[PDB]
Structure formats: structure tokens, C-alpha cells
Amino acid sequence: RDALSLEEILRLYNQPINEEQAWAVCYQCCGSLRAAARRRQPRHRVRSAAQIRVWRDGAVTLAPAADQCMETEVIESLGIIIYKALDYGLKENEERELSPPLEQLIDHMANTVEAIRSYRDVMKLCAAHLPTESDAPNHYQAVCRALFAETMEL
């Protein structure tokens, strides 16, 4: 097989993703969505983790759900789905403590803050999490590549 859904990955591990994987899926998915916007592809909200496809080479793409849409709404729905992958298997009354830069990323993506407006803004914030910003493409590809290979061993 060449791709696993984020949903499959969560089920196989029966535990949430780690923080680095959240940063990486976010960066990588936004990279693909940005390439698709260049070709005026139809925009789809991320309804569940099933739509997020992690590939053997570490690319991450967004499939349409089996069933107008602003760029910000795709981002918002991705932010929500990523948060649920970090929260996977927790009781409704418990809450994972995220590092502050990652909480901030999610808060801004989901518009729950008490300012991100494109795929490119999300990528900039993900790149800034690394000590050396220019390592982002190779590092985040490597994280998702490892996430795939490891899940395939189980």
C-alpha cells in the first residue's frame, strides 16, 4: 500500500499523534493544498481524519469527503481535525497539555482565539517551530515518511 489515512494511523496505534507529527502533517498538507489552489482545484472542508492521506514518500494530501468554501474554512477544519488527532482516546473531561507554540497554531487555525489567512501563513508558522527554518521541507517530509513506515510495521 502507498497511503494510509490519518484515521487508520490513529486506530492502528490506538493513541494520539505526537506534537512533531502534528506540525508536520499541517505543513505537508498545506503544501499540497497550495499546489492544488494553483490549478484552481475545488476546495473541500476536512470533515474527518479519514480524508487526510499520508504517503510512503512523506507527502500528505487531502481527499474529498465521500459525501462555496473559503481558504480559511479549509484551514479551520484542518485545525480542528489535527486537534482531535492530538486528543485521540481522551475522556471528554480530560485535556492534553500542548506546548504553547502548538496551542497557538491550533487556536489561530480554528479561529478560537480570544492572524492566519492562507495556506502559506500556516506553513510559515510551522517552519518557525524549527531552529533552522530552511530545514522545514526536508524535516517535515521525513517525519511523515517515518510515521508511514512505522504504522506499516504494526
Partner: peptide
Amino acid sequence: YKIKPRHDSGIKAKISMKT
């Protein structure tokens, strides 16, 4: 990772209200 009791109007709570 650290687990703590759900925070009133923290991130988990704000996100539960969007869905």
C-alpha cells in the same frame, strides 16, 4: 505527554463548540 482536567473555556472547550 501531560494530561490535565479539562479547562473551562480552554482550547479543548472552544473546539468542542465549533463542531
